[PDB]
Design a binder for this molecule. Structure first.
Ligand SMILES: *[C@@](C)(CO)[C@](*)(O)[C@H](Cc1ccccc1)NC(=O)[C@H](Cc1ccc(OC)cc1)NC(=O)[C@H](C)NC(=O)CN1CCOCC1
Ligand SMILES: *[C@@](C)(CO)[C@](*)(O)[C@H](Cc1ccccc1)NC(=O)[C@H](Cc1ccc(OC)cc1)NC(=O)[C@H](C)NC(=O)CN1CCOCC1
Ligand SMILES: *[C@@](C)(CO)[C@](*)(O)[C@H](Cc1ccccc1)NC(=O)[C@H](Cc1ccc(OC)cc1)NC(=O)[C@H](C)NC(=O)CN1CCOCC1
Ligand SMILES: *[C@@](C)(CO)[C@](*)(O)[C@H](Cc1ccccc1)NC(=O)[C@H](Cc1ccc(OC)cc1)NC(=O)[C@H](C)NC(=O)CN1CCOCC1
Ligand SMILES: [Mg+2]
Ligand SMILES: [Mg+2]
Ligand SMILES: [Mg+2]
Ligand SMILES: [Mg+2]
Ligand SMILES: [Mg+2]
Lengths: 196, 204, 212, 232, 195, 222, 222, 195, 196
């Protein structure tokens, strides 16, 4: 995997490649690594497919039950539930998750949860095997309060490079836009992003 | 299977006023089994004395080697080798076997016949020279010997007093070690006389 | 350790050394390796030191509870079996105990039981236990007869420990002697090997391997 | 049985005449990758104690939550929660020390080295260390990780024993700490330039300084160094 | 291989060596002689790794016999033992060392004295009044410490030896099928046929 | 060990502690870790004690023969080259960590060599177990254009940091000053801040305390 | 893999007189080659005229002392403020240690005080609870250095009466508190010289019928 | 432990069991009886891991004795052997299994027939005319294949057994200090004192 | 290490950080990783300090002997000698070397030699532990036929990011400019490059 989440003026955008590997074999070239845990709280999954899947399902269950009793949960709350699962089961899990959500009060927020199970609130976050190759690029090119079109380009160019160098990344670039307007799914094919 | 603690044994050396002393235990065993109570670890080539602890086959081998070398030295040089020079010869010979060493802890002792100065020195298995004003220790009860010597020793002891100090240092150190003891020998060395005394110690 | 105990015409002799080791470091020369369980029962200690000390002390507490409940002193067989069943529960956990339960009762007479941390329990007339058991056996077996006198039996036991104290690097210090009769155990003193060796060497004319 | 993932490096500290000083950089390393740069590793408890933590950051965050919860629990049914029955540094330390040793005894340690700095209610300086093994010790100067090897030697030149504490001012003490932080930036490969520093004084109280930087660095001599031996 | 003993008395050296040769769960032979005559007044017993033992013993035997022919003279027991020790001392730092322990019993005709040397596979030599290799020593040394006297006769030495064999037969785990006993004195080497 | 090297105005100074260890035991309380390669090229050694001494003597011997062959005073870079190629050939198995310094016709020089054969250049260096304690002092107090007296002070201070704070270092401070145009001065035991206090008691035994079995005169003459 | 044990160094020493007993210990605390503290006491007054030290792994040492101090407290509650005798304390400590037989306290423990006849008493333990009363015991890192010296100077081992042909032993006698402290100070200075984990300071706790007194002495800091 | 044999003849079952108890390089006892009477007409011999052997044997003994008292009736050898097998079959999948091999010799009073069962520590049961555990079988089975006949008497069975012990004493490496022999028949269990 | 070499209009520039590590301890913070094997043929060293040093010295010796007999060697020739040593001793070496040189015929050339001992001629090359973090950045920002000032900025910005993310990189940024004009050494201190 190569995954990222980036806050901007109107909210937050999540981004991911679509490659799933079993060794050097690509088990799925059209994977959906961006997953819904609530209406406007999503996450990017990296590491063990099975582990991240089981975690995401438990979180989705917790937040659905939270909503039934206390109404819409904050993005911080969602990240805390992810953390709790990742931290307490650190010995048995291989999960690097980025949590991203849109409140109306707090606007766009991004929390990253590495292997250990620590929580880190950031303006933007990158993760997965392919992220190593774009630390330099992302740091030089990220700006706060970007527009939607600028953030889409930032993610597209970033993941394009991550895909180009990482063999464990590839396929299509999926994106999910989180704003007050709603939820928008975007896809970008090789023939476009490869020749950037 | 640690070569330095299969057979067991100890050697200690001390300086006094115009004199030196070197002492050793008599045990040779095979781990827990005590085999010999006559195995002396101190040898001499002319007026230079050499004590050797560690693996017993190497003790014997090195004695035979340094006898060989000091004999050829004397024939060519037409004089007895001195303690300072012999110390260098021991160091060279041990370091020659750097990556296949003799598992030993040698100790040189003697009085320089020209200057009259007392001299003692110690080595690691690989040849590193350890020179000292006061004392040198070696063997399976080296920790024990260090503690005894460091407390009991004082400078400029007379030969008769020095004998008591070195003897008590060895005896009490040996009695706290399973692989050392079973008898002891002490050499008192003056400019032109050498007295060798066997000590009475506990036989367990 | 070297410990022994043997049955003979005049009861039981029990003899032990007093050395404690931590590798090649001599930890002690004055350790008590015989525990006096009651006026008629003795226990010898070999192997791990806390293991022996703790469980044989615990052992005495169980036997005290037996005579309170049953109004009768516990048998040597039952005593040794309480210990063997105890260590068997711990089998594999790494206890190290080489023990001899020696005593007298009316129904049994003089009795010795060997019990070890493997769960082995054996009734017998002669046993030697510990790192220096073989050295003790050598002297004891070659001089043993059933018709030994109390005076000769006491000496043979003493001499057998001395033999092992000399040759075994993990045995020594001093010899503790006991004699068990129909009237109970009798202590026959602590004998330092420092003086005992030379006394024996001179008087007996033995130990000719050593420089006199 | 753990392995530490996201880690924090040295925490350094010392006593002075009226109180204590403690400092630690703002880095969260991910192995050789210098991953996170906005990490606060000094955590105040009340207005009289600062806990400095190195090692695993996920475990550090857990300890933050415990201290946060300790303040809440102490306030329950306690009219003197902000007076005589406030949390002391010695109470906070003994709590953590108990936890650290319990966790090591269960073979599931909190992978941290901790220094609790503060001032007691009677004015006495408090400075004590505890780590993943539950080992505890106190000294005029204390440091974790590389700090133990490089900072302590420098801080001990100022305060070498107990009698040197009354003779050491806050100006001299802070200068030594800031100097030590520079040396660590020169020589520790998992350190950062940005750091936080905290002073707990018996008179002026808790002063927490954020976003400090190492400065007055000597790099100019590098231009003269050519090659590794025979290069001209 | 396993049990080899040696006892030096007033006028002779007595060597006792077990007869069993075992491999696996089978005793292949019960009449094996674990010794070689190096010279008319020098005998060497041996024990250790299969193959190595005989190969080493015969190699030494050939060398000593060669020396005897060359000089028309018998080497002293001390001289033979020193030669043997050096060969083992070389061996231990070889690619494949001889895993052989030996006892050398000899009668020095110049000194008119019996001599017993114990040498292990490392090249560790000691002169002793009595000696043993392997597990035997754990019983025999203490036994001899008690019963041995330096001025004993050959007959007294054989009784002292019987006492050792009896103890070993009682307390040793393995059946070593008795021993072959040989005496070395001023008249040379002879075997005791009824032991 | 703790060893250092410091460059100054008209030359270079090196220093070292005098402790030798075998495990947790102090084998030598006053050993010499400053080694002469040539009259004006000296070497401070840390690591395996015999290796540092043997490798410094071998190269020192070959440097002397080279100096006689070329009719020239030896250079530090020659010692550096010979030491590093020797150490590299043995793939780290010769555990010598050296600070090489000296003056020669080219000028004054300061280098360090690691056991695997890598060399560094610097104005101030430290090697050994107490190198971190020493480097902390060097990084704090070093400056460009040091005088002779300032460099000796800085070097000895760096060694003291090792002596007090590192358990692998102790006892005394040895120094060697190599100045251009002058003879190198070897300052053996320049500082001795670890003198043993008077003992509380004399353990001189009454004569006859030890029990003796035999006596004999030993012949040492022909 | 996580290793739950560590070695904090240091060394301890207990000597018993006729009407008194001392328990000494150095104040240095270490890990590997670093000094953690120059003054960290590990000899404690536990009440009822019992002093205690558990040297080795400090975390286990502190845990044990803490549990024993607590054992003394509950002994008073459960048995009408009865004084815990030194022999009873020793047996209690055996059970504390043996309770963790299969996950041991990595410490050598020594306690000192007065027995029920008013005479000086020293007890010493292995890590898993085996104990023994003695006149003399050293524990910890430098135990191997100090112990044989104590055998010689306290119990007069290997010392015979002059001129008696090694036939009459030096007679055993109690030492004065002045003489005992001399031996303690010399024992630690000697141990400090040759053991890297021993030094900084010496703290002695003396126990008489009047109570528990303290004495402190400087040791070498290298 | 080590050597336990069993032979079923016309009218009886004969069990032979070695007397040695060894630990390390010392034979601690040479008169050990490696058997327990489970019932008047059923005998069980045992060999294996130290401690486990006796603990298991006595545990079975207690259970069979309990059954006898409860029902006032003796279980058949077949029934006892099946009970023993099941206990071992449970044991092998326990946390710490009993490492004990057993032979069960019994006389079925209802059938008037002798019966010998060989059961290993895994719970592997077989009824046999002759049986052995450990290394003994590698010699005795082939020997009995040759010399055994089904219609032999008890005296013929003892001579056949002497032939086994002699072979074992000749070819086995360890000294097992002879055997204790016991006979099981219609009249119950008795020990042969001179073997 | 973070190292790189970049060809441009007038020739080629080599670049490197100055950090040498023994674990997490910085053994030398002012290291010179750019080494001369000939007048206008230099190399960047990454991997084992001892191995790369021993290799560079042997190559310098070979090229000095080449020059005595056959005149100035080509950059390709120098790379071939490096390759020969790295390939034939691949089992005993840990050396990642970039070779860069200036001919008058061939202008600027860059050859990279990874662990295996393979040779790769490239327009520009990056290597060392810190290079992973700047693959994305360098690919997006490199252009052929850059000017001297542009190439210096490209290297400075690149190594600045590599240093920022890699703990095994740091100190000063050294550079060596190879053109027809001659050889120029450049240095850049933290106070400048850190705040880029
Ligand atoms: C990139 C490919 C590599 O990290 C991504 O992290 C990707 C994330 C992803 C994939 C699918 C759906 C959502 C998110 N991860 C994988 O493709 C993952 C690679 C991986 C395997 C094991 C790991 O450690 C436990 C870490 C990462 N692929 C898988 O999990 C596949 C489906 N299964 C296997 O490879 C079989 N594994 C199972 C776990 O044990 C090892 C063998
Ligand atoms: C002789 C000396 C051979 O050791 C005896 O067996 C002797 C018997 C004995 C009995 C009671 C009191 C003292 C001494 N045994 C020892 O001295 C014993 C030897 C031994 C050590 C470790 C063992 O591992 C299980 C087994 C035997 N020594 C000790 O017990 C020493 C004093 N203590 C330790 O080694 C502490 N260890 C014990 C095992 O657990 C870890 C800590
Ligand atoms: C400090 C004391 C390290 O603790 C120094 O490096 C010191 C340097 C030195 C130089 C010249 C003269 C004396 C001292 N080194 C030592 O004192 C050294 C420590 C050491 C031990 C073992 C090592 O490898 C495992 C490396 C360093 N001590 C010794 O070399 C002693 C004298 N010898 C041994 O311990 C025996 N060696 C032989 C080589 O193989 C390892 C064990
Ligand atoms: C960065 C720091 C990491 O790769 C660079 O590659 C740097 C390159 C460099 C350093 C100095 C001079 C020129 C070029 N390499 C190092 O600093 C290097 C790190 C390294 C060590 C071992 C390796 O595998 C063999 C690979 C890289 N540092 C060293 O070589 C230092 C001087 N020595 C040690 O760390 C001791 N090593 C010796 C080899 O065996 C392991 C222990
Ligand atoms: Mg001894
Ligand atoms: Mg002994
Ligand atoms: Mg010290
Ligand atoms: Mg290499
Ligand atoms: Mg950096």
């Amino acid at each position: 995997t190569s995954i990222m989440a980036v806050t901007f003026k109107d909210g937050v955008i999540l981004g991911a490649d679509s490659r799933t590997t079993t060794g050097a074999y690509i088990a799925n070239r059209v994977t959906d690594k961006l997953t819904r845990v609530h209406d406007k709280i999503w996450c990017c999954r990296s590491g063990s497919a099975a582990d991240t899947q089981a975690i995401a399902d438990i979180v989705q269950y917790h937040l659905e039950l939270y909503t039934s009793q206390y109404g819409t949960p904050s993005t911080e709350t969602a990240a805390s539930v992810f953390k709790e699962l990742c931290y307490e089961n650190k010995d048995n899990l291989t999960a690097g998750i980025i949590v991203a959500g849109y409140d109306d009060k707090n606007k766009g927020e991004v929390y990253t949860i590495p292997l250990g199970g620590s929580v880190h609130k950031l303006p933007y976050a990158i993760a997965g095997s392919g992220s190593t190759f774009i630390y330099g690029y992302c740091d030089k090119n990220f700006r706060e309060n970007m527009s939607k079109e600028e953030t889409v380009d930032f993610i597209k160019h970033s993941l394009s490079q991550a895909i180009k160098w990482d063999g464990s990344s590839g396929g299509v670039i999926r994106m999910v836009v989180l704003t007050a307007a709603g939820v928008e799914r975007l896809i970008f094919y090789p023939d476009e992003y490869e020749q950037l | 299977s640690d070569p330095s603690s299969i057979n067991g044994g100890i050697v200690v050396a001390m300086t006094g006023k115009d004199c030196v002393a070197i002492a050793c235990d008599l045990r040779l065993g095979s781990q827990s089994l005590g085999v010999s109570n006559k195995f002396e670890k101190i040898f001499h080539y002319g007026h230079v004395f050499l004590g050797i602890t560690g693996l017993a086959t190497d003790v014997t081998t090195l004695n035979e080697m340094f006898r060989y070398k000091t004999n050829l030295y004397k024939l060519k040089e037409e004089r007895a080798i001195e303690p300072e020079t012999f110390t260098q010869l021991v160091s060279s010979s041990l370091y020659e076997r750097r990556f296949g060493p003799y598992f030993v802890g040698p100790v040189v002792a003697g009085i320089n016949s020209k200057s009259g100065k007392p001299f003692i020195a110690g080595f690691d298995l690989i040849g590193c020279i350890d020179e000292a004003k006061d004392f040198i220790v070696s063997g399976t009860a080296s920790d024990q010997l260090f503690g005894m010597c460091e407390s009991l020793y004082e400078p400029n002891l007379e030969p008769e007093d020095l004998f008591e100090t070195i003897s008590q240092a060895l005896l009490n150190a040996a009695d706290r070690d399973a692989l050392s003891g079973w008898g002891a020998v002490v050499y008192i060395i003056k400019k032109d006389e050498v007295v060798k005394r066997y000590l009475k110690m506990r036989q367990d | 350790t070297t410990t022994l105990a043997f049955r003979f015409q005049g009861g039981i002799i029990v003899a032990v050394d007093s050395r404690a080791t931590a590798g090649n470091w001599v930890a002690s020369q004055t350790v008590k390796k015989v525990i006096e369980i009651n006026p008629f029962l003795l226990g010898t200690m070999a192997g791990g030191a806390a293991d022996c000390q703790f469980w044989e002390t615990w052992l005495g507490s169980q036997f005290r509870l037996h005579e309170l409940r049953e109004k009768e002193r516990i048998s040597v067989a039952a005593a040794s079996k309480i210990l063997s069943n105890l260590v068997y529960q711990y089998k594999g956990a790494g206890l190290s105990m080489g023990t001899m339960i020696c005593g007298y009762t009316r129904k049994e007479g003089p009795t010795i039981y060997y019990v070890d941390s493997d769960g082995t329990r054996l009734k017998g007339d002669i046993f030697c236990v510990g790192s220096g058991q073989t050295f003790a056996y050598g002297v004891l077996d070659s001089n043993y007869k059933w018709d030994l006198s109390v005076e000769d039996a006491l000496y043979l036991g003493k001499r057998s420990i001395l033999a092992a104290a000399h040759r075994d690097a993990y045995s020594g210090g001093s010899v503790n002697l006991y004699h068990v009769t129909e009237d109970g155990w009798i202590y026959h003193g602590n004998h330092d090997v420092g003086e005992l060796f030379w006394k024996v060497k001179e008087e007996e004319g033995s130990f000719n391997n050593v420089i006199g | 049985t753990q392995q530490p993932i996201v880690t924090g490096t040295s925490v350094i500290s010392m006593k002075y005449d009226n109180g204590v000083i403690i400092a630690a950089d703002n880095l969260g390393s991910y192995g050789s990758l210098l991953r996170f740069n906005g990490v606060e590793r000094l955590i105040p408890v009340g207005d009289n104690t600062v806990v400095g933590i190195s090692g695993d950051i996920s475990d550090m965050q857990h300890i933050e939550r415990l201290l946060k919860d300790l303040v809440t629990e102490n306030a329950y049914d306690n009219p003197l929660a902000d007076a005589e029955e406030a949390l002391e540094p010695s109470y906070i330390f003994e709590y953590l020390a108990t936890v650290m040793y319990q966790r090591r005894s269960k073979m599931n340690p909190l992978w941290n080295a901790i220094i609790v700095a503060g001032v007691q209610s009677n004015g006495d300086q408090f400075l004590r260390y505890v780590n993943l093994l539950g080992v505890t010790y106190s000294s005029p100067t204390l440091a974790t990780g590389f700090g133990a090897h490089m900072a302590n030697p420098l801080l001990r030149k100022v305060v070498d024993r107990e009698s040197d504490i009354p003779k050491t001012t806050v100006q001299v003490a802070e200068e030594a700490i800031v100097n030590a932080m520079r040396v660590l930036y020169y020589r520790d490969a998992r350190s950062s330039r940005n750091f936080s520093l905290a002073i707990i004084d018996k008179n002026t109280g808790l002063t927490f300084k954020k976003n400090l930087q190492v400065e007055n660095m000597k790099w100019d001599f590098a231009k003269d160094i050519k090659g590794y031996g025979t290069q001209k | 291989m396993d049990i080899i003993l040696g006892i030096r008395v007033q006028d002779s050296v007595i060597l006792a060596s077990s007869k069993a040769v075992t491999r696996g769960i089978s005793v292949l032979k019960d009449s094996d002689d674990k010794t070689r005559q190096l010279s008319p007044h020098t005998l060497m017993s041996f024990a250790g790794e299969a193959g190595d033992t005989v190969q080493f013993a015969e190699y030494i035997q050939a060398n000593i016999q060669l020396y005897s022919i060359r000089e028309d003279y018998e080497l002293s027991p001390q001289a033979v033992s020193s030669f043997v020790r050096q060969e083992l001392a070389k061996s231990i730092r070889s690619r494949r060392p001889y895993q052989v322990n030996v006892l050398i019993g000899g009668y020095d005709k110049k000194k008119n004295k019996p001599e017993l040397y114990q040498i292990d596979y490392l090249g560790t030599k000691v002169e002793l009044p009595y000696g043993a290799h392997g597990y035997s020593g754990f019983y025999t040394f203490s036994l001899l410490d008690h019963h041995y006297r330096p001025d004993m006769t050959t007959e007294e030495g054989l009784d002292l030896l019987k006492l050792c064999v009896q103890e070993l037969e009682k307390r040793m785990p393995m059946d070593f099928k008795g021993v072959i006993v040989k005496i070395v004195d001023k008249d040379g080497i002879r075997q005791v046929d009824d032991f | 060990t703790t060893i250092v090297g410091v460059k100054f105005n008209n030359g270079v100074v090196i220093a070292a502690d005098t402790r030798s260890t075998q495990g947790p035991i102090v084998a030598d309380k006053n050993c010499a870790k400053l080694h002469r390669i040539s009259p004006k090229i000296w070497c401070a050694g840390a690591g395996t004690a015999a290796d540092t001494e043997a490798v410094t003597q071998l190269i020192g011997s070959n440097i002397e023969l080279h100096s006689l062959y070329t009719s020239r005073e030896p250079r530090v870079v020659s010692a550096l080259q010979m030491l590093k190629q020797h150490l590299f050939k043995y793939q780290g198995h010769i555990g010598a960590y050296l600070i090489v310094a000296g003056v020669d016709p080219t000028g004054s020089h300061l280098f360090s060599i690691h056991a695997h054969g890598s060399t560094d250049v610097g104005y101030y260096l430290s090697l050994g177990s107490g190198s971190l304690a020493a480097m902390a002092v060097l990084e704090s107090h070093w400056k460009q254009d040091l005088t002779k007296e300032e460099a000796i002070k800085l070097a000895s201070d760096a060694i003291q940091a090792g002596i007090w704070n590192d358990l692998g270092s102790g006892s005394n401070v040895d120094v060697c000053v190599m100045e251009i145009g002058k003879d190198a001065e070897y300052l053996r035991n320049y500082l001795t801040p670890n003198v043993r206090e008077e003992k509380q008691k004399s353990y001189k035994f009454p004569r006859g305390t030890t029990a003796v079995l035999k006596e004999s005169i030993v012949n040492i003459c022909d | 893999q996580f290793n739950p044990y560590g070695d904090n160094g240091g060394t301890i020493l207990g000597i018993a007189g006729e009407d008194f007993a001392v328990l000494a210990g150095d104040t240095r605390n270490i890990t590997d080659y670093s000094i953690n503290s120059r003054y960290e006491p590990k000899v404690f007054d536990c009440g009822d005229n019992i002093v205690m030290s558990a040297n080795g792994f400090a975390a286990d040492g502190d845990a044990l002392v803490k549990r024993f101090k607590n054992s003394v407290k509950w002994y008073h509650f459960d048995h009408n403020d009865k004084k815990l005798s030194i022999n009873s304390a020793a047996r209690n400590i055996q059970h504390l240690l043996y309770g963790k037989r299969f996950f041991p306290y990595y410490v050598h423990t020594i306690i000192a005080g007065l027995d029920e006849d008013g005479k000086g008493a020293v007890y010493s333990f292995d890590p898993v609870g085996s104990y023994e009363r003695e006149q003399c015991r050293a524990g910890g890192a430098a135990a191997s250095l100090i112990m044989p010296f104590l055998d010689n100077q306290v119990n007069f081992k290997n010392q015979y009466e002059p001129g008696t042909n090694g036939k009459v032993k030096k007679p055993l006698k109690y030492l004065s508190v002045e003489e005992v402290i001399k031996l303690v100070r010399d024992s630690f200075t000697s141990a400090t010289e040759r053991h890297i984990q021993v030094g900084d300071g010496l703290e002695i706790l003396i126990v008489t019928k009047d109570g528990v007194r303290k004495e402190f002495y400087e040791l070498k800091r290298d």
